[model samples]
Target: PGSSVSGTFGCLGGRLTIPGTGVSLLVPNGAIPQGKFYDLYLRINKTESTLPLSEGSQTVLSPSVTCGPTGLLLCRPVVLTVPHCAEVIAGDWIFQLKTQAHQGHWEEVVTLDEETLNTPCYCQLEAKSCHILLDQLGTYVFTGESYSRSAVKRLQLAIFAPALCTSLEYSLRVYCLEDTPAALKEVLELERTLGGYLVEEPKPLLFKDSYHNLRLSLHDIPHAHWRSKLLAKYQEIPFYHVWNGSQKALHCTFTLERHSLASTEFTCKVCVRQVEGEGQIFQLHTTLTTQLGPYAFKIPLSIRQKICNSLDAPNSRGNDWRLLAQKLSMDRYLNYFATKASPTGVILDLWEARQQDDGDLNSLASALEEMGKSEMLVAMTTD
Candidate 1:
């Protein structure tokens, strides 16, 4: 009895047991390659040992000891079996997963999911580039949407071995630690429209891309703790504030009427509605303009008598048309040429009332076009 042996074995004719080192192999009669019979090879930290720890440390092999009449038994008495050579095992695979939500923005995909999924090596262990394991205990499942602070899932393990042509892949990351929610439930609404003459001026409202450089401030108000005592009882009517920032959402305005006791003219209406709570009511409106005579009429009178015949100047012209009729009842004619700072006393009062091809600023545009839709400013002239 004299002999020696090493590790690594896998055949198909018959005989299996190289799982965890109890070494056992026979697969002789025709060596093996009917596609690596029952393929299941594994070898790790081999430390060399090839069957036989008894009978005077046995090493016997002579059932007509033939090794190459077609090749298949290199003899290690529990370790010799190969047919056309086999040993291409190297896959350290991973992934033992479980989840509920956000497990660290998972990321891992070395590439290899298709090229015709070639998966082989059912443990037919040996070595040389190619490792993708996870079927010895395979497990996977993932879902979506959780990016505001954690929630990810990724699993890709492709191991193609159309009889060891070559293929490798491994990645699995899971997480669930997010129960988010403590206090945040919403629903509030209100539309807006603040008028002018809140006793003098505060109608700087705008809508269209909605709310910008806003100016209807009843003292810096924007939903001031829910429109502070309703804007302190309409600081003299014509106001709206709860500025759309959220109390759900609201745009405001009030004062249906307020400037007519012979102070010339005043009758307001700017109500808009907005809601986002029971069903729907995003926004709604209620008429929006009308203020004639003195309390400063709201625009359109041929841009106010050509901006009051450009305050009839020539220097020292005492009441240039009654201060251009008191600057067309206190400024705000179609936003003074859509405003961009025009003051040389309003660009020479619109360049001396467009070098008058005049009819004398149609003398106060036929008396402020007869105070109201008399065919909407009687077809405003003075270009």
Candidate 2:
């Protein structure tokens, strides 16, 4: 399934992110008309069949992300950022930003040339990601043609394990995926159905098209608690099979046996490296006894809007969004939110991401009370 995050925004624009994917949408202030609120969605397209087919030597370098409601006119352009794998060494590769038309045909919105800005869209290409300024919303992706052997692609490494272990045997699954949000989204869903959880945060590594194989090893496992079942010290996967094949889960399973079934604590380090290029390491310290539940609730849109209405403005008493952030302990990026037309909206969006699992309204209420925003607290309770 595709990964998505959605929120309601009015004239005070906000930001949204498909968490852990390095994919985000920034709706700027005054992007919508006064008294207008739209439910916007940011999604990473997970199906290869839905993506526009690449022709000849052109390869899709980034994940396809869609911002909707499609065709909603905005007063200002929004910024979308997606990670890419191209080794963008100036003259080595040619890049284009493509969007799917309403009729299912693919059209180039712009060819990325640092010296040119005559196209409908502008692309800022970095070493591992591309940022695009878009006035319209639909599906967007980046494609590149690399003519030189020096060009390389990036890969992401993630580790997963079953949420609960019923026996002494445990298995850790390490995934080697194309560095795209959609690839990770697919794995997320697969693991969700398989009752697995991520053992560590994912990391990106560059993979060259050169024929060297990728190697992975599990290390530093406590011999007193667990032992590896594999005869080999490390495992190797053919790089071509992962880079050129269809975007699917290509993983290695390392099985282990614990000396005691009562032991729930596990610690280990997993390392994955390209035989000739960059690599990543996962330091895992996990407890296997519990399976965390899904998020209980999200702050209601009505309550969020009420908070924004009450605290978004600047006040002489310093009882505004800035104070609210400080009260909630979310004051790290004040400068970024200070420039937004609706700092409260952006902060609430972030709060939704952080507090989604628990949705502890009591803490939020306490924060408001401490800030002397009793009217907002009353509104929240009435809802």
Candidate 3:
């Protein structure tokens, strides 16, 4: 369960964004060498394998993101924008940026407000987002400890139901997860596997550690067609269980029954409120419908053709289509592409098939630059 976006970058830098997730990677101009290109990827880690352990009273406030190829030197510092959940009131929170090492251990890269020239990274913290400037590429995450109980972490609320109801009884599950891309990515995978559809767009609410439970209530159901199964009008999820526990998909399920099996339409209002302060009301109107759905972006065909035409010819440096394959990490079957008349075209076809979901033209352009085809890169970029 991971969400990722990638692109190719040469001397002329660009930006990569994982849509719908406020996370972005900005590569400055001249970051990559004129004769070299890098296949860069920004990914939100959804599994716990690489997650840094949290000590007592410390919690992860942002999703763990990996910007790579790791350890590659850059000409200039790149800016990575990540959204965090901390209330970020001046003195109420202490934040630290952490990176995973080659030994599979987490190391503190820098503490917020304590950066100097000696540190490898610098952080610009805002109320709901953090912009980091770093020279190195690697996995990064933000952890924070609160000095006051008033410090609140944001939570995203989502409602889901089965795409097609086979029984007269239907259930809606409302998930309460940390406002992180990884957390939402996990839920999205689970919902896809369970054949569930999103009944409403997710909403965010601040969760305070005030020991107040979250209450969810369903109202205005078509009484003539649908009826609630529970005698109570509301359901509750313990606050501490959510705040103190791992960022799991904590949810509440509301089951309702329809008077007739032929009825397929459903409409209701879901009110989610914390016992004390913040809350959101979602208006749900849905019919039982089936649907189907990749990565964040793709490479343009125009650039692909330019790369194929330029690199299809053989050269003395062995910087032809075969070398291009190796540079892009697609060298599994070198001889296979060589057998084709237009080797670069065949290689590009393979690239499109495999990376159709994630590849971008920037990387291809960079690869061409590395192959001493700056003229081709210039031509592609200029036009």
Candidate 4:
């Protein structure tokens, strides 16, 4: 059966307070921009410092929203170089605070493809030397924009509980300012230099679950998981609801960046998951990508597990585990280079570091045509 995940949503942070208004709120962050858009938060007008007034507050803008482009690599509709532009509107977006726990859905997060700072006018924006305006003030309930409704929700909760609500309100005092032209230039240069290095989401290098059947079945599932409960019911299996256990985050971002045909940088993070509680077992096998050096240095889940099992054997204690971890580290080490590998374990040499990244363009750059779709482009030969 296909694997599934649940109960990994909602606010990841705590409360916020409506400036000088005794109104505390919750603002979530880093959410996908999807569904009805909203920048909802709570505000306790005149809430006491020690025991905030229970006067209560509720406000709703739209269903919740996110700002920034979707599906574009490097577009990053949400500007990291710049802060969010938010504004308190004429309505009660704070009403959401008193309501029961809820969640906002996101379409999906996207990352940049090619690395290039092509937008000259947007250079100032990227460098954040330009003022991001809250032109739509009183339209929402804050002075900054957010990446997701979930993010806004968490921020609402997190900022307030920490007692930064009042300070946050003061900062929301409005006004738009852009950095000096020099600052903008510097920002643009940084963006251009890094090109598309900004990671929207780092994809996995190995597909542990999909290709290898590398699974982490938990005897115990985290509580209050409705989605899990529903799935278990249909399958006629009792929900694996236990006190505390978690599944690895199944999904990760994956992208391709071309090196000088000599080598490429395989930048990805591997997420090791384990079931928590009494049975806290670390599951270290998942994901694979052929992109780095064209899969020359990848270790399959079968291979990874084989090594893991070999290490964890009863006789395989101490030095043995270290040795296993060492071998695993070696496999990972090879991935950095465009060297080749096969299940049988064969390796081919390629260009070195500078050759992999910023070397002489004549020797390192891929022609416009050779970048994608190997079938269409003529191969660059060593001759």
Candidate 5:
């Protein structure tokens, strides 16, 4: 009895997976500096071929769900006060969380609810850095469309003091229809307009410090470590492979290291909804389990468009965010002028240069695609 103690217990690692379902996402306790904006974060390994809300998925049940862009590390949270002169978007807002505590010798806890959300409520959490503070990084997105005349505010949720994230179980809540009025309509239309330019672009991840990056990552888990079993940690690396577009259904296969402790039980669920016509959210039942907690989670993520317009480039003369990253690094030739590559040597640099500029890249590639002469894409894939 003198040799035993509870040890350093905390919710440190987590991941969610269903045997037959095709889904993988994350809800981190991201950084939230005291401010006027909220952060919403997401991590996904897409099974579908196309991005969400596209012309093709028009008939799909969840058209809003997209395959998403490449290298998106935008999963983190931030919070800010509701803006003045802005009417809050009335409705139930929800989130999903996957967490795990110490690996061996732990208990499996479950939540009664599934993945969903509520409204007319206030919810809160503690957040810090996205990577280093990932032990509790968070994200809450600014889902709005400020038309020329209206400013949309986020509906504040009732969050508990010192967010313990004990609420990680998927849940749902309702809002009074009267809360959102017509201003919400303007927000939706504006979203569609912005979609043309913003969709697939690296939109803001809305960190507590108003910072975010576009990144993506993957891991190769060839074997299982027996050390994990005793620590109460479950094998979740298999979930990452099932996301590689390799299997039709969610095929998760992982081996865990048997540890001195036991595996922790969790309640895991899916969060699905139908954002219907007329700017309303209709809730849909999601996955079967309740949560993922009680392990030393191996966090893998990707960030996209890191060198996008605002981040790599900051305009000093214009006092604007629109600038090129070339200024910061200086060595990467973001040409002040344009030129061509060797006709026979391969158009690698030329094409890469064009990719940095959206308009020209679109034109150059789309033209080759139309002519059916795109040997370049085929060549790069092999490299």
Candidate 6:
């Protein structure tokens, strides 16, 4: 049995190539709307042998309606690039198909492969201060049709201008824009600032909660669709529902970017969506990505767990506890604790910080103020 995924479709960032074709689709993270699952497929067809030839003609085929995003298939086609203009050269057109949920039909998305002649013109669109494509093509044609004592000047000009074409010469019937270097520089700079390199990879902070009792087998979806319920009713906890498509089971993971109250439990109710209280209760294993200040580095799950686990058993007799920073490999959390000070001038008691976030969430930045507003910990570092 092939592995299958169920639940809502999420943007699994990266590129997907069309098999047996020189084309690909680039999907970025968070592009898929948060609630839909889909069946996406792509295929190519070659039909060059039977086409009736014309002076300036081309073929453009769209993808079959069997797969891909539904909106892309139904939306009006937009110009991806400037038109292709040439004479007599032939090639294959690539396309894709998409079929969406609740629909029994398919739609096509096509790629055009066209060749047309560029009409002779006194005016041509300039791509840059230094160049234009029309000028180069004109030069090539003129150079090839060299003038001779027997050749009329008018006849030679017709060789460069398709409007003056004979049945034997190429007809200038289309226009294609050539790219400019200055525009390329601008595109490259924009990519550097907000491109794929900037998307954060999904971390495994909550994946560790894959304990047996916490596991629940959900109804496998169609291609990848089903009930979107495994209710973890937190006020607003930062969580992700990860499904192991092959196993047909769903796992809920949590990430806590800050600290929480003395004794809180993140409660989850897992069961059928339509059925009332037929649910299972479980707690989450939360990890912190950042803490204390915006500039602070992430608190590794291992160190955060250790610090919290140790704090649950703190000794009342000692006011000074040195969380031996030497033992933990992640010194960043130690540095975070050292650099930050509470409003009251007290520093974090790295020795007593809770190891996991186990309650309802309060902020998207998942802050400390609402974690357990009534209490907090501070430390005086050995440094």
| Residue 317 in candidate 2, Cα distance off native in Å | 45
Error of 5 at 348 (Å): 9.6
lDDT of 4 by residue, 1-383 (tens): 00111111122212222222112221122122333233333221110111111111211211111222223221111111121111222211222111111122111111112112331111011111111111111111111112222211110100001112211111100000111122122223334453322222211111111111121222222122201212221111111110000111112222122222332112222222211201112222111100121222122334434433433343423333333223322222222111211211111111111122223322311321232213222132111
RMSD of each: 42.5, 11.1, 13.7, 28.0, 24.8, 32.9
Best by the TM-score measure: 3
TM-score of each: 0.14, 0.58, 0.66, 0.14, 0.15, 0.18
lDDT of 4: 0.20
Model 5 clash tally? 82
Whole-model Cα lDDT per candidate? 0.22, 0.71, 0.71, 0.20, 0.21, 0.20
Task: Give the Å error, residue 171, model 3.
Answer: 0.7
Q: Estimate the TM-score for candidate 2.
A: 0.58
lDDT of 1 by residue, 1-383 (tens): 00112222233133332322222233321223334433333221111111121012111010001111222322211122111011111112121111112222222221222111232111111111111111121111111111111111111111111111111211111100011000000000000121111121111111111111222212222221212333344222111122111011122333122122222222222222112111111121111111112222123334544543543332364334334434443222222222223222232223222222122544445534543323443455333
Model 3 clash pairs are 8-362, 8-363
Residues 167-198 of candidate 6: C-alpha lDDT, one tens digit per residue: 22111101001121211222233335522111
The better-scoring model by TM-score among 1 and 5 is: 5
- Could you tell me how far off, in angstroms, the CA of residue 2 lies in candidate 5 after the best superposition? 33
lDDT of each residue in 1-383, candidate 5, tens digit only:
21111111112212322212222122222212222222222222221322121121011111011111223342332111111112323322222122213211111121112311321111111111011112122221112121222222222111011111132222222211111112222223333453311111111111111111111111221123122112323222231121111122221121223222232221222111112211222222222111222221221121112112222333456321111222212112222111111111112212222222222334433433443433653232222
Worst lDDT 10-window in candidate 4: 154-163
**Tens digits of per-residue lDDT for model 2 on 132-199?**
65657888888876545566777788899999898999999999987766578779989999999988
Q: Which candidate model has the greater lDDT, 1 or 2?
A: 2
